[model samples]
Target: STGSATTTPIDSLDDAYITPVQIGTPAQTLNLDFDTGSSDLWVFSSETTASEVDGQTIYTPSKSTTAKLLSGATWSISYGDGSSSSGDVYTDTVSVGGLTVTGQAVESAKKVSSSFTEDSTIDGLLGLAFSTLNTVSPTQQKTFFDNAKASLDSPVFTADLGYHAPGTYNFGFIDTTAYTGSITYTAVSTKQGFWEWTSTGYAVGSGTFKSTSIDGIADTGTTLLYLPATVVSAYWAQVSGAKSSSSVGGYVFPCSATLPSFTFGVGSARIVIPGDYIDFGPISTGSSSCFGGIQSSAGIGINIFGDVALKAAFVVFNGATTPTLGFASK
Candidate 1:
C-alpha cells in the first residue's frame, strides 16, 4: 500500500521536522519527529515527570484500549550531543499518513533530557531506520517502516525535506511530481544501522569536482551537515570573513557574506545545495555573524549528511532485502 504524510519544520532555523501520527485505539494524535538517525519509536508519555512536562503533548497508554504493556521491556538511547530519552515498552495501534501497523512497539518515555523538555514542537520521535538499531532490551522492536515494508507495494520510503516550507514522507512509492530528472541509486551499508552511503565527490560553488569518496549517513535527526575537516575547510575557505570560531563553536562568517553553493556527487548526478540554504542563520540573536549549515565531523567519529544535505535533495530509503538509497533533484 502507498501512503503520504506532510512534514513541517517546527522552528525558524528548520532545526527539527515533525509529522502527525495516530496512536492507540481511539487515536491520540501526536506530532512526532521522524528520525532516521535512530531506531526507537519513543514518545513523551503520561509516565514522564510532571515537572518535566512543559507544553508538549503526552501519550497516555491507559486511555487507549488497544495499548498493551510489554512486561519487563524497557529502552534507553542517547545521542552524541547528550540528548537522551528512556522508557518502558507498549504495543499499540500506530498509524502514519494512512499506513497502519498493529501492535507497533510504542516506547513511552518516563524520562527525557532537558533539551527535549525545552522544545515542545515534537512530542517524541518516530525512528525510520533499521530495527537493528532499536534500543529495547530483552527483545528488540521493529521500526514502523520495517513492519510495514513487507505489506507495502514496494519496500521503500522517501524523504523530501524542505528549507522553510513543508515537505513529504511517502511510503511504498516515490511521488513523481516531487522531483525532477532521474533518481540516482547507491549501495547502502546497514551494518551500522544507518542509511549510510558514500558519495562520489564534492565541489564548492563552480569549482572542480573532487573525487574524494566521502561517506556518511543520511540523518534526518541531525540539523547540520558534517563532513571531514578537509572538505569543510575547503568550502569555508572560499567564503571571505569566514573562520572557525571558539566563541560560537564551529565556523561562522559575516551575515552579509555571499555564500557559495555546495555540490556532492551521487552516482554520476551532482546535487547542488543552494548557497542561501547554507546560511543557517545568525550565530546569536542580532549577531552579525552567521553559522554555517555544514561543519567538520572531526571529533564526532562519523560524518553525517544531516537535514542540511538531505533537504537539498529528495532521498529514497529502499528497504529491499538488499537495501539501497536513491537521490533526486527537487
Candidate 2:
C-alpha cells in the first residue's frame, strides 16, 4: 500500500522537522526526526534513567506485547552536530503513516548526550538514509523504508522542507503539485550511506557560477549549509563587518548587514538561496550580531547541504537501482 506523511518543524527551534510514528502492537505514538543523513530508528525509552530524560516522552517496550528484546544487540550513534545516543535494541512493529513494518529494529536509548537530552520534543530519529549505515551490532538492521519498499508502488520518497512552515514527506509516489517546473535529476553515490552528489559549482550574489565541483550530502538532520572553508570565507567576504569568530562560532556579522544571494548548481539547474536565509538568526537573544546559516566544513570533511539549502528546493530521494536525486523549486 502507498503511504505518505506530513512533517512539521519543531516549535521554538526551527532546527529540525519531526513526523508522527507508531511503535509496537498497541501503537505508542512518538514524534521522530526523519533524518536522511543517518540510518537508525532510535527513541527515548524506559531504559533511560529518569534523570537523563528531561522532557522527552519515553517508549516503554515492556508495555507492548509486540516488543521483543534483541538480546545482546546494541547501538550507538553520534551526529555532526555533536548530539549522540546509545542503547539496547528491540524488535517491534513500527509504522509510518499507513505503511507498517513488522519486527523492525528499534534502538531504545539508555544514555544520551546533553544535546539530545536537552531537546525534549524530539523523541528519536527515524533515519531515511541507506540501511547500510544502521548501527546495530552483530547484524545491521534495515530502515522502515527499506523493509516496506517492495510493497510500495514506486521505491521513492520526496522531501518538501519549507521555511518556517510545515511540509510534507511523500512516500511511494511524487506529488506533482508539491513542486514547480520540471525536476532536475542527478546521480547519487550511496557508498557513503548518504544521498551524496557533486554540484557543478556555485556563485555568490550575481557573480558568474564557478566550474569547480563541490561534493556534498543532502542532510535534512543538519540545520545549516556547510561548505569548504574557502567557499565559506568567500561568501562571508561580501558582507560588511563579517568575520570568523571563535567565540561566536563560525562566521558572525552585523544583524543589519545586507547579505548576498547564494546559488548552487545541480546539473543544469541552479537553486538559489535568498540573502535573508543566509543570516540564520541573531547570535543571541536581542543581540546585534548574527551567525551565518552557511559555515565552513573544515573538520567535517564533507560539505552538507542542510536545511538552509534543502528548504530552498523540493528534493526527491529515489531508491531505484541507481538511487538518483531529483530537485525542483517549491
Candidate 3:
C-alpha cells in the first residue's frame, strides 16, 4: 500500500509543518505537526482543562465509537524546559493520507503547558521518530510509521519539506519525480532515538568545505539549524554587525545584513542553503535586529539539522533491519 499527503508550514517563520490525519469512526480530521525529534502522539483534547485549551481543536474520544481506553495507560512529556503535557491513552481507528490503521494509540491530553496553549495552529503532534522514543510505559506503543510500514510497499518514508511553501510526504515507494539527482545513503543510529547521521563536513559561505565529522539529528520539528559553536561562529563571521547577544539570545544581526549561503556535505553531495534562508526574520514584531536560523548547539551533546537545512534537500527515512537515511539534491 502507498500513501501521500501535503504538509504546509504553519508559523510565520516556518517553525513547524502541519499535516492532516483522521481519527475514529466518523473520521475527525485534525491538523497535526509531524515531528521527527520526539515520539509522542499527544493532542489537545476535550479532556484538557478549559483554561489550557485556548482556541485549538480538541479530540473528544466520547464522540468516536472506535475509541477504546487503554487500561492503566498514561503518558507525559517534559522538554528541556519545565513545560509538559500528558494524559490517558486510547486505541482507535486512525487514518493518514490513504493509509489506515486499527488500534493506533491516540494520546489525549487532559492537561497542557502554556507552550502548547499559545500555539493554536497545531491540534496535536504526529511523532515520526523511532518507537523506542515513545513516552508510553509498561507496554510501549509504536509510532504510526512503524505500524504502517508493514502495509506499505517498502518500509520507508520520504520527506520533501519546503521552506515557506507546502511540500509532500510519501510512504511506501519513493517518488522519483519528487527529487532531482540521486540520493546519497548514510547509516542512521536509532540508539539515540532520532533520525541521527554524521555529516562529512560543512562550508561557511563560499569558503572551503572543511573536512570534519559533525554528528546530528534530522529533526523536522526543530525550527533552526544548531551546530557546534565553532561552526556556527564561522558562519556568522561572514555577516557584518552579527553578534552573539547575551540579552537578545543566540546570534542576531542587522535586518539588512548581507548573508552568505551555507553548504553541508552528504557523502559526495553538497547541499547548499541560500543566504536569505538564514535571515530568520526580525527579532521582534518590528525590531531592526534579526535572529539567525543557524545557532550554536555547544551545550547539547548532539547537533540538530532542523528545517533550516532539511528544506534544502530531499530526505528518505529507511526503516529496514538496519536503519539508514538518504539525502539528495532537490
In terms of lDDT, the best-performing candidate is: 1
Q: Is candidate 1 or candidate 2 better by lDDT?
A: 1
lDDT against the true structure, per candidate, is 0.93, 0.90, 0.88
lDDT of 3 at 301: 71
Model 2 agreement with the true structure over 1-330: per-residue lDDT tens digits: 777878899964468898999999799999999999999999999998678899888789999999999999999998887889999999999988888889999999999999888888899999989999999998899988888888888999888987878888888988999888989999899999999999888999998888788999999999899999988988999999999999987999999898998999889899998887787678899999988989999999999999889988999999998899998987
Q: Which residue segments of model 2 deviate by more than 4 Å?
A: none
Among the numbered candidates, top TM-score falls to: 1
- Model 3 clashing residue pairs (backbone): none
Q: Give the C-alpha lDDT of model 1.
A: 0.93
Clashes of 3: 0
Native-to-model Cα distance after best TM-score fit, residue 199 in candidate 1, in Å: 0.5
TM-score of each: 0.99, 0.97, 0.98
lDDT score, candidate 3: 0.88
